[PDB]
C-alpha cells in the first residue's frame, strides 16, 4: 500500500583486511550469516562475528572448493630500516625540532 | 563624563568635501551623497590606473602599425615586430611610437637595417 | 549582598567529581525492564563512566562550584 519505512544501515562488513594487523579480541568481520568461516587462531561469535585470538597478520583463504575462511598468523617484525627514506625524514623532523628549540634561549642581544 | 561629539564629525565631513570639489550638482553639496561619490571616484581611479597601462600599449601599437604600413606593400606590425626580435633589438613599443611621430626618418632607418639584414 | 551564582541542583544530583578532577556519571537504563536485559548488559550498565568530552561545557556551565580539571 503506502511504503517508506526502512532501517538504518547496520554497519556490517570487513573491518580489517588481508595482511593488516590485528589485536587479540579485535573484530575482523561482522556478518549476517557466515560469508566467511573461522580459521585458526580465530574465534567466532554468536552473531557469527569473527574475531582474532592472537596478534598478527590476518589472511583470507579458500575454504574449498567454493567458500572462504579467515585465519590469523603471527608475523615477525625484525626488519627496522636503519637507513632509508622513512627513517631519514622522521629523524630530520626530530633533529630540526631540537635545533630550532635550542637556538631560541641561545639567542644573544 | 558626558561627551558631545563636537567637531570630530564635521572635520571628517569637511576633509571629504574637499575631495569632491567640482562634482556637478548635488554631488558637490550634500554630505551623504558626497561620501559615495568620493568612494566611487577613488575606485575608478584605482581601476583606470590599471587600464592606463593597457591603453597606452593599445595606442602605441596602433601608431606603430600606421607608421610602418607606409613603406612596404606587404608590411605589417606583426611582420615588423618579429623582425625586430630576430635581429635582436631591445626597443619597446613606447619608444618606437614616439620615434615614429617625433623622428620619422629614424624609423625609416631602422626598417632599412632590418631589411638589409633579413636580406 | 551581591548575587552569587547558583549551583544548578538537578545537575549536581547527577554528576560528581573524582579526586583527580574528572567528571563522572551513572549509566542510564537499569531501573525496570531488567529481566529481558541479559546479565552481561546489566553489569555494563552498573558502572561509573567519565562523561563524554562533548557535554563537558553544558555540565561545567551549570555547576560552577564543582572543582574540575580539564587537564591543561
Amino acid at each position: 500500500t503506502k511504503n517508506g519505512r526502512d532501517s538504518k544501515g547496520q554497519r556490517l562488513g570487513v573491518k580489517i583486511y588481508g595482511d593488516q594487523v590485528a589485536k587479540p579480541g579485535a573484530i575482523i568481520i561482522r556478518q549476517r550469516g557466515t560469508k566467511f568461516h573461522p580459521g585458526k587462531n580465530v574465534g567466532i561469535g554468536k552473531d557469527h562475528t569473527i574475531f582474532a585470538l592472537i596478534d598478527g597478520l590476518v589472511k583470507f583463504e579458500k575454504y574449498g572448493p567454493d567458500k572462504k575462511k579467515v585465519s590469523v598468523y603471527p608475523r615477525e617484525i625484525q626488519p627496522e630500516n636503519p637507513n632509508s627514506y622513512r627513517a631519514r625524514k622522521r629523524e630530520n623532523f626530530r633533529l630540526q625540532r631540537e635545533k630550532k628549540k635550542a637556538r631560541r634561549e641561545g639567542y644573544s642581544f | 563624563t558626558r561627551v558631545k561629539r563636537g567637531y570630530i564629525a564635521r572635520r571628517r565631513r569637511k576633509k571629504i568635501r574637499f575631495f569632491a570639489s567640482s562634482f556637478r550638482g548635488a554631488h558637490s553639496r550634500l554630505t551623504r551623497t558626497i561620501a559615495q561619490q568620493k568612494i566611487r571616484a577613488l575606485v575608478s581611479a584605482h581601476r583606470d590606473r590599471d587600464r592606463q597601462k593597457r591603453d597606452f600599449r593599445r595606442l602605441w601599437i596602433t601608431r606603430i602599425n600606421a607608421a610602418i604600413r607606409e613603406r612596404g606593400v606587404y608590411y605589417n606590425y606583426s611582420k615588423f615586430i618579429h623582425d625586430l626580435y630576430k635581429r635582436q633589438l631591445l626597443l619597446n613599443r613606447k619608444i618606437l611610437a614616439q620615434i615614429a611621430i617625433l623622428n620619422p626618418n629614424c624609423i625609416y632607418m631602422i626598417y632599412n637595417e632590418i631589411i638589409k639584414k633579413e636580406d | 549582598k551581591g548575587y552569587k551564582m547558583k549551583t544548578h541542583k538537578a545537575s549536581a544530583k547527577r554528576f560528581r567529581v573524582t579526586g583527580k578532577g574528572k567528571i563522572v556519571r551513572r549509566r542510564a537504563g537499569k531501573q525496570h525492564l531488567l529481566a529481558k536485559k541479559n546479565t552481561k548488559r546489566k553489569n555494563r550498565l552498573s558502572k561509573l563512566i567519565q562523561v563524554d568530552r562533548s557535554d563537558y561545557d553544558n555540565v561545567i556551565g551549570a555547576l560552577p562550584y564543582l572543582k574540575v580539571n580539564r587537564k591543561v
Binding site: - | - | 544548578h8 544530583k13 547527577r14 554528576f15 551513572r26 542510564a28 553544558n58 555540565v59 551549570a62
Partner: protein, 171 residues
Amino acid sequence: RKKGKRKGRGHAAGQGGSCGFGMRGQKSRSGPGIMRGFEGGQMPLYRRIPKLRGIAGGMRAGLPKYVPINLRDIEVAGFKEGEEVSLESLKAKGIINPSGRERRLPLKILGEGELSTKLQIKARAFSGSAKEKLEAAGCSVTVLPGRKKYIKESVRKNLARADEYFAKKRA
C-alpha cells in the same frame, strides 16, 4: 592592562554591525539566553541520566570526620625530639590551617613516609600502618578520649550484663 573590545563601532575596527553575533535568531537577540543545561527540547543530558547513588534518596552525604596527616608532613616540619605534636602545635607551625568545619574536628594520623625522630604524639585516632610505624620508631602514642556518648541507664544495664557474662565465663 589589555584594551577592551568596544563592539558596534565601525567595521574596520572589530566586531561592527552585527558585532560577531552573525545573522539573527535567538542567540543574536537581546535579552536573557536559554538555560545553560538545555538542548533544544531534546531531553537534556542531565535529565536523561539517573541520580547519583546516595544523594538520590536523601541519604546524607559523606563528610570528612578527621583532619588527616601523614608522617611526611611531620618529617618536613621542624620537630626536634621530645616535642609534643598534638593538634595545637600543628597550627603553631601552620602545616594545618583549619577552617570552621575543620576547627570543630579531631585529628587522625595516616602512615606515609618514614619518620626519623622520637616524638610524643597526641591524637584521637590512628590508622594501623600509622601506629605500627610509630611504635617501630620508638615514639609514644597518646590517644585522646572522645566525648562520652550519653546513654540512658537501661542500656548501661544491658551492656554491663554482657560484661558480667564474659567475666563469669572466663573466670
